[PDB]
Amino acid sequence: RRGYTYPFGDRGKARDHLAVLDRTEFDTDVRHDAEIVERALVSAVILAKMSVRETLVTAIGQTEPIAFVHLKDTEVQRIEENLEGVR
Amino acid sequence: MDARAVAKRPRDPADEDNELVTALKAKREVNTISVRYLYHADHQALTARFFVPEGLVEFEAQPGALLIRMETGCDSPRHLYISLYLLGIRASNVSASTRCLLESVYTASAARAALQWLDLGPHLLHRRLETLGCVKTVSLGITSLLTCVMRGYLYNTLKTEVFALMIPKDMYLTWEETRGRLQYVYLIIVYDYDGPETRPGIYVLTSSIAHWQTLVDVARGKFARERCSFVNRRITRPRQIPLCTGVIQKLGWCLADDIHTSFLVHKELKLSVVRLDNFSVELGDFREFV
Amino acid sequence: MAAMEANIFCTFDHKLSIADVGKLTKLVAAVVPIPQRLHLIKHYQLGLHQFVDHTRGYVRLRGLLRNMTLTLMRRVEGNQILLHVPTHGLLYTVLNTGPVTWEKGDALCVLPPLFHGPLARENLLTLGQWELVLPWIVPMPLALEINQRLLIMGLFSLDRSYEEVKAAVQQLQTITFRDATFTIPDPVIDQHLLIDMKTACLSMSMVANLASELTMTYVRKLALEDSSMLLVKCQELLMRLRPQHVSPDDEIARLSALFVMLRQLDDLIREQVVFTVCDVSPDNKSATCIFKG
Amino acid sequence: AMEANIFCTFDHKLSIADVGKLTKLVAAVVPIPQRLHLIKHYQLGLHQFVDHTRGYVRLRGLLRNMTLTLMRRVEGNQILLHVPTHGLLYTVLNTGPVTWEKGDALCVLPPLFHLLTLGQWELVLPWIVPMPLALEINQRLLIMGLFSLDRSYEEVKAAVQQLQTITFRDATFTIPDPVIDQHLLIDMKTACLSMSMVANLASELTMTYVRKLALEDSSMLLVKCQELLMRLDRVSPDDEIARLSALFVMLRQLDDLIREQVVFTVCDVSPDNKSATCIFKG
Amino acid sequence: MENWSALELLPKVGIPTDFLTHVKTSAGEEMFEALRIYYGDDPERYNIH
Amino acid sequence: MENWSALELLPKVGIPTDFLTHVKTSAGEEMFEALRIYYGDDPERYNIH
Amino acid sequence: FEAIFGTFCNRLEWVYFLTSGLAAAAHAIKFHDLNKLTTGKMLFHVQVPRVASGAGLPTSRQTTIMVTKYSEKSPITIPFELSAACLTYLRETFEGTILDKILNVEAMHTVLRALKNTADAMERGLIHSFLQTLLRKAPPYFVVQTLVENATLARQALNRIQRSNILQSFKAKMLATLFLLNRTRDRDYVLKFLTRLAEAATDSILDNPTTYTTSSGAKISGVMVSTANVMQIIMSLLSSHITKETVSAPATYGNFVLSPENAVTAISYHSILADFNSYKAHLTSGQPHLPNDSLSQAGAHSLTPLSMDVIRLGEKTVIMENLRRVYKNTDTKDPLERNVDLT
Amino acid sequence: VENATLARQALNRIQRSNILQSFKAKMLATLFLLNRTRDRDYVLKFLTR
Amino acid sequence: TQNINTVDMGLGYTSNTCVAYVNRVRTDMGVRVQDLFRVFPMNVYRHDEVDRWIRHAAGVERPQLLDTETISMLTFGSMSERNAAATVHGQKAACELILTPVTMDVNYFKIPNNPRGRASCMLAVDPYDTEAATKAIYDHREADAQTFAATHNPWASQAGCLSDVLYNTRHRERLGYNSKFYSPCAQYFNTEEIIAANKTLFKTIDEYLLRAKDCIRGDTDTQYVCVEGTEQLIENPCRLTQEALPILSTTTLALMETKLKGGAGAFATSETHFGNYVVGEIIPLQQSMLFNS
């Protein structure tokens, strides 16, 4: 919903990544939730990096890293300690 | 400058010789073209040629019909020319028998293509259509040719036939039994703000009122169900922004002593119509009212 | 029938004096209201003397005057008045009768008269309990001010006393448009004024709803940074006391409907342009005009 | 049988190439401040109107009341302007930045994007444009003026980048910004302040007035209206008089943007799209 | 059913014609069998084909 | 349909008519626009209205 | 300096419809009141010859067909445009100075130049529309070739066996001669094909015996027409049969004037009957045969001699016609240069 | 001289394709003309072309 | 404006259009294929990856997500494919059917036969007989008379077959296509009017003269259906006989070589090896077209 009513540097690739993001339905078996949530995450991070108006690596073959966009680092180390504790 | 030129009678603009005649007689030649009376010289019907496909020329061989143009967002046709009779499908005011009749006559590709184009965008019809006037001639090949009249009367060349504008009976609308001496005729498009049935109401109003404030004041009080429907769709579905609950525009004026009834015939499919004989065209833009 | 004839011969059925025809020949190229549009009308329909009800409702007379036909006067001879009907956009002059000063480049409007009394001394054709009262031709600022003040008096007269509305009548009726004073003759609450108030309040609620976030808080944002005389003149007429979301494809439709609603509001007081003077006479009695009717 | 032709003289020596430049602008529109008979070129067009600190809206308010003449002929030391009347039909050049079609309704606009030039004079002619692009430009410029104070943020620069361009048939055209050096011109400041004032008074007084009217409610319409206003919402009477007069004066200071009168409607354009035939309308 | 254009363009004799009632009454009450009463003037009668 | 009695009674122009096919073959296959083939001896030309 | 030599204006070469050889297929008739009719019909009362039959045979009945045949109209238009500067310099002098005479004479000469060009264009467009209307009523070669040979069999309505033979010979003659002059350059075969073509189509019903007669009493039967280079191929290959000589042509269009009696039936019964006085005379007398067609008497009465190409073949002298002059420097195609799609 | 009627506009793509095809056809056949053929009528036709 | 009118006073047909001299072929006279992806542009394989793989391996670009207004225009009519970069040869035009590999090629590729599968001659039936004509076209319990098998291509000669739904225009409207594209197979499959054209013989001749031809935009590198006025109609004998001519075709370059070497009218004969074969060019328009001069 937030990506519909937003102006971008380019409309077509934003619409394409948003089209990958929405209509996302998980299967019942837990094996193929991971790749679908990963393609949802890479679409969301592409919308994030382009909506803040900074470059993404457009090299063909390498995917963009799943990371938080423009955060204060105390919440980031909070995320690292929480994610390591659940590791 | 001197007193004789202002004391002379004005020069007859018709009885003086034509520019071709005063070019010929000063040099004294002859040509096979008969010249001495040019046609269309004493004309005020401001014509405009128009090209149309075959699918939109039905109900137009008989002269007098509204050649209302539209625009599609697709770039290859920038405009198209709908007739008023072809707009009756999207007209909610058209009865189901009449709609089933006039859908059985426009079964070419262009008419239904325009019908699909009308109900596709995020806009209403008043920012989709544009009125031109009345058609008087037709060439009728495969790609036909129409000559509309923007301003003036509706007459044949050499003034021998005053053409007449017909409108279908399901779009005619008068508001007082005591019709005035001179009366004007406007193009009302109202909107019922139902969800699925957002198909508008088409009306051709013929009233003696020429003012604009006293016309929209008596127009609010004759569409109060649709006005309350606009407020109802405004309140039950918020964060959607509709506009222009009704739109009017001045189409012309008639004499009120010859607005009568008739019937169009087109491939033996008759249709009862309201006929306006001595019609004039004086356009106004699409104004709105809430 | 025959169409709208260019000439309407008004015939005075009474006997006449000499001085009344002396006043009548001064009133050439003036405006008259005609309801009939025949060829050989009498003098009863000529002028607004057929419309003086026992209330003289000014909003009622204002609504009725636009429904009539504006017509020009020509050829004042013995018991003949050649009324030239108007046509769309030609150029022929006028002659004002009210004491309203005119300038160049402005528009004009037809209106019922003002400060109606014999202290003004209208020398307007007294005969047979019939006075030919003429419609005033006023420019657009005076017409807009009198319409907005009449609508303010209509909207203000709801749920208030019979002394505070009189305190508003004695305050509001004075107009000082271009160094001249004009009062409002007998303004009454009326059903026509009531339905115009109804449409006005509905349009006011529609602009109250259709306004977006920034479209309301822009003056509150501007009062934090810029400071002018206009902002201190208007901000003490408002109340006393980083956009969170913004979507221009929504605001475009918001303002698209908002201009429609503001048109629907402002059309109730900006009636119709009926004359646009190109140039005037220096004594400010006549003027060359465009677009008769 | 000569017609109304305003004789427009010049006040400067011109070359033959200058007249050859000027004779290309025959069937074009020219704004004139007063329906005169003999006029110089200093009162010929819009460059007499262009102010450094006043902008588009103040040019448009001085554009509603101009006699939109044409240029019938050009000759030695003079121009023959041709005043149009409502009813006739005339050829108008396609001097606007955007093309037309058959059947559109055309009106006037100031030239947003950038002819004869002298030392102090530059001959400039107004844009002639169809009505939907005119309304689109109005609603673009008012909103772009409304993003003036909050210009410092990083998203709204992309938002006004999106708002800066328009789209017609094959016309991917963009406009200049109304705000210069992060502060609004007083013209667009008044234009936006009028809108904010009428919104802020409509959201304040209409509730009181509709609940005053609700006892005399004689229709099924005003009650839905006050229910709508109630669902949104979750002193001495001279203040009320002043507030209503302030409402109507901020409405009166706004009518240059709320509408546009149709001036020309095309009838047939020239092939290769450089001129058209238009019936003039008031 | 009858070219009334062929009534005006041909020449005709002049006869003092007297109806029992008024002529518009005997017209509009269809004592005759086919009538083409029109007000004003029609240019229908001229364009002969 | 036209008045074929007017074709029969009125005088004609004697022409050495010839065309490429047989007459009945050109008649039964409608080489022309509108035709009329009376086969015996019609009395209809001796009736005039 | 630069040397501007004498300017060159192209003289518009002129071509009129009657002085071109294409008018032999036509019959030029002028008629001022053409803007007031719907159709020009032309009726025929065709009695057939029967033949006595023997015993037991079915006796042929005395029958007679009747057939109408109408007209086809196609109006021809040209726009030509005038600047308003040309108008305001035409009808208006500017103090009678020497700089007004140049513009006034220029405007008048431009107007008359455009008028002469428009008249020549109207003549060429008349030629073009006449050739279009003639070509629309033109069957191809193989159909008239099969019809001239199998007409003596199909004397009843067409059966299935006869239409089967006609379709087989359709395919045969179509596969024979789609491209003849490109294929073979035989003199005798091309001449035999052309005289078979000349004897194939039938003549019209009327012809003025005084028109289109050459010197030494030779009578023209028809006109053939082609483009330039195939006419060059015919003139280089069939050169032993081209007697380049003069011919007679109608000088002007024959006129067509309705009688004072014709206006009465024009107004009342909405119809026009030509040769009206001769019709009432021959009806009152009783001689049921007119001396001539109504449309034949309305033709021309004056003739002009002019040089052209006539070929003799099967003693059917026909005029060969080249159409380079009519469509040179024009903006339309030749109607004789089509395309063929062999799928 | 062969394709002159068809250039009634500025000549488009397929017409100059035909022109180039006829270039390739004519340049190979009519290159050394008196060395291939020595018929009198062919040199006559070539000289008048 | 000059109103003219002609009266065709000839009893029989009085004018014949022979065909004389062919000099240029504006088509390529070669072998390409009709771009069926451009004909029907909005038919996508429902799984996404197989569609991208097919469109990439066929050498065809994506449809660029044509919006529904452009889609409605494409159903109304539109030119999609641009002209090529350069072309010495003519305009491209060809087509494709689906054949059974054991069809009677000796009777069906050596003589002109209809590639629909049966003898579809509209003239051979009785006039005004739609039932007998549609039985001759669509039924398979009777044999046609040209080839006495009832069928020579069961994928092509039955109602509702592959080539029907690919080439009958009535079935092609239900799938949606570029109507500006020309398809040379549809003239053998337009049974919607082949039924409507089985008139009498002279009526069939005049129906062959007007409106039986086709219009082709000559300037564009691909073939387009024109409009009348921009280009004249193009006369076609294959619409009359409902046949098509057998151009020569080798299946091995040895046969093309021994056809090229011998010459002198050695083109109309059909020479058949074990698996290889040539069919005779029936009219020698590849033998002496270019070398005549």
Residue numbers in the entry:
A (entry chain 1): 89 to 175
B (entry chain m): 1 to 290
C (entry chain n): 1 to 241, 255 to 306
D (entry chain o): 3 to 116, 124 to 243, 259 to 306
E (entry chain B), F (entry chain Z): 1 to 49
G (entry chain C): 50 to 392
H (entry chain D): 197 to 245
I (entry chain C): 1078 to 1370
Paper text:
Through 3D classification and refinement with C5 symmetry applied, we identified the portal vertex and resolved its structure at a resolution of 4.2 Å, revealing high-resolution tegument densities similar to the CVSCs of other herpesviruses. Unlike the icosahedral reconstruction, which showed that each triplex of the viral nucleocapsid was exclusively associated with three copies of pp150, our C1 reconstruction of the portal vertex revealed two types of tegument densities. The first presents with two copies of pp150 associated with the periportal triplex Tc. The other, lying on periportal triplexes Ta and Tc, is completely different but reminiscent of those of CVSCs from other herpesviruses. In addition, our C5 portal vertex structure revealed 10 short (27 residues) fragments of helix-loop, which are structurally similar to each other and are all located close to the portal main body. The 10-helix anchor contains 10 aileron domains arranged with 5-fold symmetry and appears as a helical ring surrounding the portal. The C-terminal loops of the 10 aileron domains consistently point to the portal wing domains. Through hydrophobic interactions, the helix anchor is tightly held in place by the capsid floor regions of the P1 and P6 MCPs. Each of the 10 fragments of the 10-helix anchor is strongly associated with the capsid floor, and interacts with the pDNA. We surmise that perhaps this 10-helix anchor—unique to HCMV—functions to dampen this squeezing/tightening process.
We present the in situ structures of the symmetry-mismatched portal and the capsid vertex-specific components (CVSCs) of HCMV. There are four major components of HCMV capsids: the major capsid protein (MCP), the triplex dimer (Tri2), the triplex monomer (Tri1), and the smallest capsid protein (SCP). In this study, we show that the portal of HCMV is composed of a 12-fold symmetric (C12) main body, a 5-fold symmetric (C5) 10-helix anchor, and a 6-fold symmetric (C6) turret, and is specifically adapted to pack its large genome. The main functions of the herpesvirus capsid are to package, transport, and deliver the viral genome.
